């Protein structure tokens, strides 16, 4: 029973291992194993539940263990190990074959097979930790191991793609430990975590690995948003080390999402409005990306309201996620009509729900835009309106107060009007008739480069896959 | 079945006259004696509440209503069992002999169709479609296909289903496409235009209503005089003033509708007054259109105020084309509107970007906003570039 369960999963694990083993030996095929490693994460997670945990025990006995004998016992110690044929050396699949890691040449240390075996061993360990939700001592113990090992080994083009996915588990397992319980050991552990990311990021800079630098930047930018340091986030994004070529669309959407929150506090909403739109287009529409689409769609509504523009109501209607978008709908109506008591009671009841995503702190800045939008509505309907006529609409304090809210408006060129005090009314300065000026021609020249921007990323990408057609033989 | 649903709809909300519910009570009381309305009769209390819906002698015991004839009694209770016997129990023994003896095909299929129509008045939609499926396999020509589109349509008009009716009608017409004459094709197209009232498609509701003939009468689904109100109100709502002259105000079928029934007051009062540029008498015409048409009709209540608002903004835009600058003593004096209330009309219309106009406070001079050299070659010309760029880069960025 238990014997047939251990040998079945190990054969499938070696079968997937031999596919990426022969591809890294000859020249550089490394682009190919990257596609296999995408499905390796999903196929291993479903396989971990079946045939219990014993698939990883016989795999370590098969190959040579540099560090991995005591790590399995420590991993099995927390789960109250059940010992069945647990003596090392019970299962031997090598049987002296070249693709099986021939034992005599391996045990005599005349050849080194540890490079691809050890780096692959740490990957399967991190998969079971996230599946079994093992925390506390097992989180810190594995962090003290993998990091010094990566500094000792010299990573090639294919080796840099191994640990590229391991850095995500280091930051993920560290944040789940802090949110579960707060302790002095968690704050000091985060200090080493921050200094470690910057040391390896410099290593990947010389190797110019696309997937490695894409995973690190996404983890580093998130650490800046938690601490809220402006000087660290602004200086990091000025280097522009993020490759846009071979990185996945899921890694791209996460990058544009960080730039929207950073530029939101910089009081420049022109660039931040484009970054939140590009993050939606790059993110897939499947169910696994709904977690990113849920947070990104909530940030888009906050960026629009801070620009003075009001987002469409169909976004809160035709979508299927509007159940969580209900708090933002009442904020939309309160800004339009400019009601004083409507916004106060709106943010009071939902104060608890908006605290989770930290979007309630941005609602304080939304209060200023409540009247600023109402001023734009009354200014477009009335070209010349008396000073006392505005206070009768929005029920403001006094005519002395409303005069200075239009002040903050046209400083940046929002309303584009003038206040005549002697005449006693506010007149709109826009005469339209701007088609004959050269101001539209400035934007017109940008649309030519936008269509030309699609050339170099396209015409060059035709022959890119085509080199395999002429080299391979055809019927 | 539509004659009851139209009259009993006045029992929901009436802010004008109580006699509207009293005159409609004579139609409801007369039909429940001949046929059993129990699925719709009980649905009146389960549709709207806290007006006439609280009064019941069976499900929930309360009295709130202006009419006491909506409560169950011993007469309708005995008639409920009579419909389950004569229409069901008596026919179930006759249809069972035809299935075992295997006599005919189309002759037996008509018995399943007539049986399925009995479940519509009883309120069972499971056996109505079940008996229809058995007759669908025996149906070949279009003689038995005409009753298939009604069975799904009875869910929308009678059972009040705005969701599963549209999906099923598109599947039946796509599997077997015949259409018969134009009146058979209207039965599909009429619901498509009416369904736009629930999802609020605005001018897209009258697309298939205007092309439909005025002689269309579905009886139990809809009547002859009521269907004339849907095409008259939505027709002017969709077609612009230029299309009103060569289509609406002059039509062979439409002009015969208002001559027979005076309850429309749409294709005539709202048109002739607009052709004469008279907005003073044009204002009270919206009263009979809202009160005597939109309110008594069921599907026209989904929008209500949404109708007359866009009709006013449309006729106010035509006045802006006849003069560059208007006066305060023109719009706000002779037409009957007041400075405070008229300013609220266009007050919310301008920021919606639906109509561009300038309203003055002190001097009261309404100026017409025109794009001049901008027109459609400024904002609309560059909008198509980035508007299509999203759909163009959809399959380009993600490949397959």
């Amino acid at each position: 029973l238990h014997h047939s369960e251990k040998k079945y999963a190990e054969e499938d694990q070696v079968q997937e291992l031999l596919k990426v083993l022969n591809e890294i030996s000859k020249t550089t095929l490394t682009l190919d194993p990257r596609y296999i490693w995408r499905s390796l994460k999903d196929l291993s997670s479903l396989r971990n539940q079946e045939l219990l945990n014993a698939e990883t025990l016989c795999f370590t006995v098969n190959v040579l263990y540099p560090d991995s004998s005591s790590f399995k016992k420590n991993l099995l110690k927390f789960i109250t190990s059940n010992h069945k044929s647990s003596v090392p050396g019970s299962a031997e699949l090598r049987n002296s074959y070249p693709a099986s890691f021939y034992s005599v040449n391996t045990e005599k240390k005349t050849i080194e097979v540890t490079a691809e075996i050890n780096c692959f061993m740490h990957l399967l360990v991190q998969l079971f930790l996230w599946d079994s939700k093992e925390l506390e001592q097992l989180v810190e113990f594995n962090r003290k191991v993998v990091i010094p090992n990566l500094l000792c080994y010299y990573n090639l083009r294919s080796l840099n793609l191994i640990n590229a996915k391991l850095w995500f588990y280091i930051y993920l397992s560290h944040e789940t430990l802090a949110r579960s319980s707060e302790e002095i050991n968690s704050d000091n552990q985060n200090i080493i975590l921050r200094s470690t990311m910057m040391k390896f990021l410099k290593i990947a800079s010389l190797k110019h690995d696309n997937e490695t630098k894409a995973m690190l930047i996404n983890l580093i930018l998130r650490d800046f948003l938690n601490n809220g340091e402006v000087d660290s986030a602004s200086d990091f994004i000025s280097k522009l080390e993020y490759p846009h070529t071979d990185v996945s669309s899921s890694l791209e959407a996460r990058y544009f999402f960080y730039l929207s929150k950073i530029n939101a506090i910089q009081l420049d909403y022109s660039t931040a409005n484009e970054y939140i739109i590009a993050a939606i287009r790059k993110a897939p529409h499947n169910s696994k990306s709904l977690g990113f689409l849920q947070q990104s769609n909530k940030l888009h509504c906050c960026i629009q309201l801070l620009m003075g523009d009001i987002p469409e109501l169909s976004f809160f209607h035709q979508s299927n996620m509007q159940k969580s978008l209900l708090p933002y709908y009442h904020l939309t109506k309160a800004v339009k009509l400019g009601d004083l008591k409507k916004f106060t009671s709106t943010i009071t009841k939902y104060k608890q729900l908006l605290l989770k995503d930290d979007t309630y702190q941005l609602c304080v800045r939304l209060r200023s835009n409540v009247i600023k939008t109402g001023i734009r509505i009354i200014s477009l309907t009335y070209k010349k309106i008396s000073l006392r006529d505005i206070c009768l609409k929005l029920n403001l304090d006094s005519e002395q107060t409303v005069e200075y809210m239009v002040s903050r408006a046209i400083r940046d060129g929002v309303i584009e009007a003038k206040i005549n005090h002697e005449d006693g009314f506010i007149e709109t300065t826009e005469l339209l008739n701007i088609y004959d000026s050269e101001d539209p021609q400035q934007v017109f020249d940008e649309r030519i480069k936008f269509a030309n921007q699609l050339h170099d990323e396209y015409l060059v990408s035709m022959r890119y896959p085509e080199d395999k057609k002429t080299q391979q033989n055809e019927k | 079945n539509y004659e009851v649903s139209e009259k009993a709809f006045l029992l929901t909300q009436s802010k004008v006259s109580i006699e509207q519910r009293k005159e409609a009570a004579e139609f409801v009381l007369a039909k429940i004696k001949e046929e059993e309305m129990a699925p719709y009769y009980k649905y009146l209390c389960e549709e709207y509440l806290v007006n006439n819906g609280q009064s019941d002698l069976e499900h929930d015991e309360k009295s709130d209503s202006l009419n006491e004839w909506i409560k169950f009694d011993q007469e309708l209770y005995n008639e409920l069992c009579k419909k389950n016997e004569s229409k069901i129990k008596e026919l179930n023994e006759k249809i069972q002999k035809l299935e075992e003896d295997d006599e005919g095909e189309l002759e037996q299929a008509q018995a399943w169709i007539n049986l399925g129509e009995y479940y519509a008045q009883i309120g069972d939609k499971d056996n109505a479609e079940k008996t229809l499926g058995k007759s669908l396999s025996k149906a070949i020509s279009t003689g038995a296909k005409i009753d298939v589109m009604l069975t799904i349509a009875r869910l929308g008009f009678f059972y009040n289903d705005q969701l599963y009716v549209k999906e099923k009608l598109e599947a039946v017409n796509s599997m077997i496409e015949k259409g018969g004459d134009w009146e058979r094709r209207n039965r599909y197209k009429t619901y498509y235009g009416i369904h736009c009232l629930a999802v609020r498609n605005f001018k897209e509701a009258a697309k298939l209503l205007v092309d439909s003939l005025a002689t269309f009468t579905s009886i139990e689904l809809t009547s002859y005089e009521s269907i004339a109100t849907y095409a008259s109100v939505t027709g002017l709502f969709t077609l612009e003033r230029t299309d009103l002259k060569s289509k609406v105000i002059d039509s062979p079928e439409l002009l015969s509708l208002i001559s027979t029934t005076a309850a429309l007051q749409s294709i005539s009062s709202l048109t002739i007054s607009l052709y004469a540029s008279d907005y003073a008498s044009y204002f009270p015409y919206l009263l009979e259109t809202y009160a005597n048409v939109l309110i008594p009709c069921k599907y026209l209540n989904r929008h209500a105020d949404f109708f007359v608002r866009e009709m006013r903004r449309k006729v106010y835009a035509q006045l802006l084309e006849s003069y560059k600058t208007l006066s305060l003593k023109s719009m706000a004096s002779a037409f009957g509107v007041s400075v405070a209330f008229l300013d609220n009309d266009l007050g919310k219309f301008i920021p919606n970007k639906q109509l561009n106009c300038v309203i003055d406070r002190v001097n009261g001079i309404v100026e017409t906003n025109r794009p001049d050299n901008k027109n459609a070659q400024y904002h609309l010309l560059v909008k198509q570039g980035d508007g299509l760029l999203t759909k163009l880069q959809k399959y380009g960025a993600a490949v397959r």
Binding site: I310, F316 | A280, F283, A334, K348
Partner: peptide
């Protein structure tokens, strides 16, 4: 799709529309 569907207006129903008939005779 902006300022259209659910927000609506909540005015121009009866009282405001019925008042405009009396203004014609007051001129």
């Amino acid at each position: 799709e902006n300022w259209d569907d659910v927000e609506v207006d909540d005015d121009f129903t009866n009282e405001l529309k019925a008042e405009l008939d009396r203004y014609k005779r007051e001129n």
